[PDB]
Symmetry: D2
Subunit: 392 residues, 4 copies
Amino acid sequence: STPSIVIASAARTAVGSFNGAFANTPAHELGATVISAVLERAGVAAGEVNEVILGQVLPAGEGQNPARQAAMKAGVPQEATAWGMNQLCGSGLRAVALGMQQIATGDASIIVAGGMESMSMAPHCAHLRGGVKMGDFKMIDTMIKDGLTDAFYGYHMGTTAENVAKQWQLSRDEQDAFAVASQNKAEAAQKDGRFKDEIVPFIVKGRKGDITVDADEYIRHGATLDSMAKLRPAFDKEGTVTAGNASGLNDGAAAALLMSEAEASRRGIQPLGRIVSWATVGVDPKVMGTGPIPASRKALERAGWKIGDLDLVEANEAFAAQACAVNKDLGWDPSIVNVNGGAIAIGHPIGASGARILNTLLFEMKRRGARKGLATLCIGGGMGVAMCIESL
Amino acid sequence: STPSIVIASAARTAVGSFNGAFANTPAHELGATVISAVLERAGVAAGEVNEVILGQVLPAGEGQNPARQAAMKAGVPQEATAWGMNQLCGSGLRAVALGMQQIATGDASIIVAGGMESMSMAPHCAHLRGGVKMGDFKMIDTMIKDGLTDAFYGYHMGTTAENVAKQWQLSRDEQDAFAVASQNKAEAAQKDGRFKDEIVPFIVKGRKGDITVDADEYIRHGATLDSMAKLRPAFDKEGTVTAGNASGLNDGAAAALLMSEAEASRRGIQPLGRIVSWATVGVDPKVMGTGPIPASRKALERAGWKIGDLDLVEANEAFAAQACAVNKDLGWDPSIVNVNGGAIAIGHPIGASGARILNTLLFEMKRRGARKGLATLCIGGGMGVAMCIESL
Amino acid sequence: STPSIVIASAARTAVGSFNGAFANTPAHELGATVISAVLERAGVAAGEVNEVILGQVLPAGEGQNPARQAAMKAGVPQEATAWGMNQLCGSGLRAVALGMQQIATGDASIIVAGGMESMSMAPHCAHLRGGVKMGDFKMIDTMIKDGLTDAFYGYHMGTTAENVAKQWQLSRDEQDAFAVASQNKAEAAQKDGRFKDEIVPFIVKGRKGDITVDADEYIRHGATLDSMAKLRPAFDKEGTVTAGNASGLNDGAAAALLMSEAEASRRGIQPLGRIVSWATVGVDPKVMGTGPIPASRKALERAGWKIGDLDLVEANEAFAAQACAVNKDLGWDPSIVNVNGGAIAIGHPIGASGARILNTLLFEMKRRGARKGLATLCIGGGMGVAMCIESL
Amino acid sequence: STPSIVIASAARTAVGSFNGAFANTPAHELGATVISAVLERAGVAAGEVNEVILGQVLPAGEGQNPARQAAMKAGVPQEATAWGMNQLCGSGLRAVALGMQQIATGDASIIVAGGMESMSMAPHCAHLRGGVKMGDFKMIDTMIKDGLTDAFYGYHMGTTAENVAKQWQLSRDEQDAFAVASQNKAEAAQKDGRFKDEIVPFIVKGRKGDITVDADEYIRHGATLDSMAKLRPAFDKEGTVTAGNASGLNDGAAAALLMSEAEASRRGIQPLGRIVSWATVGVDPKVMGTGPIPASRKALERAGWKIGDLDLVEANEAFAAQACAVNKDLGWDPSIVNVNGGAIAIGHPIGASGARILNTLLFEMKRRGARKGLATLCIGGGMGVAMCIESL
Ligand SMILES: CC(=O)OCCNC(=O)CCNC(=O)[C@H](O)C(C)(C)COC(=O)C(C)(C)C
Ligand SMILES: CC(=O)OCCNC(=O)CCNC(=O)[C@H](O)C(C)(C)COC(=O)C(C)(C)C
């Protein structure tokens, strides 16, 4: 008699490149589009939504509770509720776990959950109430400070990726080959229409003409191992991690519509899948990229699943270094991992990422008839999140 | 049977005045102290915490996931997890209901949940990626923009208070008499030592000497009706809402340690209460101060309680206009509400506030042997949140 | 026996467009090239220079006394002196008058005087010592605030141009025809090589390569009356003044090397002319564009010249409106004025402008054998400056 | 006969401490008050002024040509002119010399010349036109960058002071003794009323009551040798220069009214003195504090005076180390130098400083009946300025 919560529908924007397609688009506008889309896709009216839960890491200057702004712009009435949350990179997936819990505790019926992020729109900042009596001071890039800098050891996420490259003795070649394989899988899938279903177009409004954005613009077409092998290391001069074998800075949103299984049945909805389990676990901040290991093992143990049971896997590629380490420790078939590419190619809109890869997982699970699935993400400050999805 | 989760223990910092005692104290530092406090108070080792969940509305510049920074500074091991969330003024109490949900769904055994806020340390910000080829630009106060300003209508929270005052025909006098009652109640509680149990002293580390802060410094000593009636309207030149009958800008943190009833009994812990229900509902952002009315009613319905069963209430005083209005609608005995004073006196450290009033309720329920209690707050953008607590 | 001071030599950079050729070139670097050039042109060694005097309105952030920075870079000895000055648009010409005065009172023999300006490099700023306790504040564009905004009435110099347009009843048609004539005369002069003599090339050092700039890049080629006529008014929605009939925002330096007539004779130098007189007079800030009227009249009377004695004139074009009013009042033959075009086409690097038009005057006087010349500028805050030059 | 220019009258504000009395008072406000005062003291109407010349190193953000704002505020007519200039610390005295040249060349009859500075109001800046697509950037303190940092060697003026200390082998003790004597002489002069004649009171207007400032607030009362000796070196860790034996960061204005000797006689004015000579000379930037040596010597030679002919001297105290060096080299009787204290005590409002000390000299010469005086200052970037004054 345990609660069975399903994902009735999902959708994501395309992922924009840094200061690219969505250079001037507030996170909450991207969120509103995905919210309306999951509702239209499921045939559910906005007024039936109890609450919107949206992960977002970089809200500075966007005003009160951007999740609420997203919900209200999507047409979800004032009666519903909304809130944001921040488990950094895990945010978008975690939000789905959290939404599932609202329904499992009988506190709601229909949740919209996911994530949203405008890294482009993130401001610079300084604390100036006390004044600066004399001397220079720093205007601080909130994207870097609040999104990409380890709070404990003081270094960029890319150095934690170097720490993983040295513990696992991963060569520069092994990482450059992984990223080339990710770009090529993503270019293949995009041209074959495999992102069409999950992507809802977004209308960037302008003065000299609106623009429809429905293609992931951060993917690199014709990615040779040459353009990878010619890059300098970005975080250590005798290291292996580069702009080419790391993910980038990106804008996007993504969302899922959750309700009980019996509810989806009552509404004539064919659900994208059932949430069987989730799990988050901590690891050393220094090697934060390993997060997916204990989070996925725990998720799998809560499902009563073996690693071999899995038919599909979205394992977020923040860095090639961390991804290979995860694929090695866990030891699943790499041919079913990031089957349509991953974040090195597609982008990593921090708060949105977890709901982005969940989209890719669900829609590709429909495409090929995979029964069991698992999405998982490493997290700055040292954590992982994971979720097991079973098709119906 | 049903899960049953208890608040094993609770603690909060004093609430500091704006650019006051905590002027230069990062939110997570305040948060850390209160995490160590709830652990110590319950007799639980930090190594036993599965997850720290902390409300926070104004984290700009503090770096990656300040809940994880509070958790680590407090000595919760890297293996645990941590996140922040934002349901604005409701964040601190919502984090507690979220934590309870973690335990009810079987995903955790032991949560620290609460909130934290340094409104003092909130930076001014500006989006400057595109560059500013010519012309003045605004450095935006994130405290005002992201905390205090309604996103839909463009005006401060105090203006929603004017809308509520007007709806309910609340005179200036009546708002002012409420504010004085609240100050006089709070100065009394302070003097008679009724804040001591709940407060854990925070030590401010400076160059010139450590300062231990263990007293709410926002409370005005010897407040009079005469003093209030001298003040000018702060939001409307023929309005009723002043600085004297509105809460303030404040710094502080507050948390609670949650576990199952059965686990408290295993550990010999005598908990502060059982979380019997909670609820959140939405309303017109224009009159967000009415949030607590449907929130408290839904919460009481979920608990199976009538309003007269309540023995003690903490209904947050964002503004006298809204506080009076909520009290007149629900009809609870004003004498069991904010019995040691409310936020006009004590302060409103946004993200911490909901855990702040929860602390006050729990320790006063204990000291007078109350059995049934409710905490509730209005939420900017048009929401309310409430929680019902029963003593063991 | 009244002292006679000559201009032995002169030089100017090309005038750069706003954030264009000299986008990242500090004013002092442009100044240094022009100091070296006037020395080279006169056959005078840097070791012989007593003082360098440079007009400069927007030095913020450039460091201590950019005039000294310029002169040291050009190898003027540490035993010499250097200072900057600021009479706004008048500065580069006032500098020369002041340098002439050093020699006249016997305090110096050899002066390099002019001005320099990098409007591109001008920063944004805020008084932040006292703090901003709460609320937004402005980051102020120093170029606009200290350069282009009237300090009394608070509006841009364009509005003073509107005031002049109304008071002199100057049509949009007349102003635009003037603007097009300036563009077309400057393009002709450019293509014929008439700026070559005065322009010294400036090498913009980069990383991917050095670029030699020796063309005035703000000059529009093939400028049409239609392109002027289609612009909207820039300062008053029912006005006549536009971006097209106003000058621009620009970068440049320019200078003159001064000595007594007898010293030039001793050296065998053929000077560019003798400074027979100068003057500066104030007018109403509201119609500051009129400055050249009383200044030119005073300069001429000090020279004992009638207006009809002039063979050539450089009257600076801050705005078509004021250029037209000045020509109307003075009544000098427009065909002898801004013969090679003016600032509408060439640009207006504020602190340099006055020495820029002096350069154009002097080299045209030489080229055509004009005997008597005058340069004059209008000045924000309501002033004018004029200088009479006679050929030797 | 030669042109003889006299100082008819003089006045200065008190010198305010950094973020002290004048923390929020724009320099031009201070200037306006001293302009009005020199007019009143001379019995000359504002309508009679031809030009205002005001030294000012740090005008960023104050708007167009603060000299003109100052002159207009004092009711100097729109028909007059005004300009600012910058020879750093020498500026306030150089303006006077420049003012004298306007009259000697017959270009003006009546000049108000001096300087003004608000180091408190100096802003922080950043060049932001190109944008900062990613990363932290610096907000630069303009007071330090444009006022106090050497542009060639990149270090503060205090480092130049160390270089002079080492070269002249000046002990810590000798420097501190000098500093203590400056404080103690200034304090005696203050108590005895010796600054009253030269100071014009300034009214600081504020919402909560006007404050009249007529005392130099930087002067330390009861300054002890021990208070100096305890300090740590501020620039070199085995240096000798400290906050105590250097001057401060200060706000002030000061000026003089000039006219020919014959015009003063026509008007029946008894002048404060005749300007007999002035000089400016350069020195190595690295030892800029030595500027007063070649400059004083040149001024004296130009006057036909031996050093021993001087009855009184104001040699500016940028730093004890340099003031000591200057006095050692010149060898004048130290008992006639800075007779009422100097800038270590009184403060150093850069652009005003040279006119400030001139005020002190003039009024002491008058009060004790000294016939021959000299004022002189060192100048960052390696210069000196000096002026010889004789009583009539
Ligand atoms: C005083 C002087 O420098 O002479 C005239 C200077 N003219 C200008 O600076 C106008 C340049 N204008 C432009 O580039 C566009 O018309 C503008 C609308 C972008 C300018 O914007 C403004 O309104 C200013 C006055 C703030 C520059
Ligand atoms: C030429 C000149 O500058 O005159 C002397 C004025 N004094 C100063 O510039 C130094 C003022 N110094 C101080 O208040 C303290 O020494 C300080 C160490 C706190 C200043 O901090 C600094 O390092 C600088 C940049 C101001 C020198």
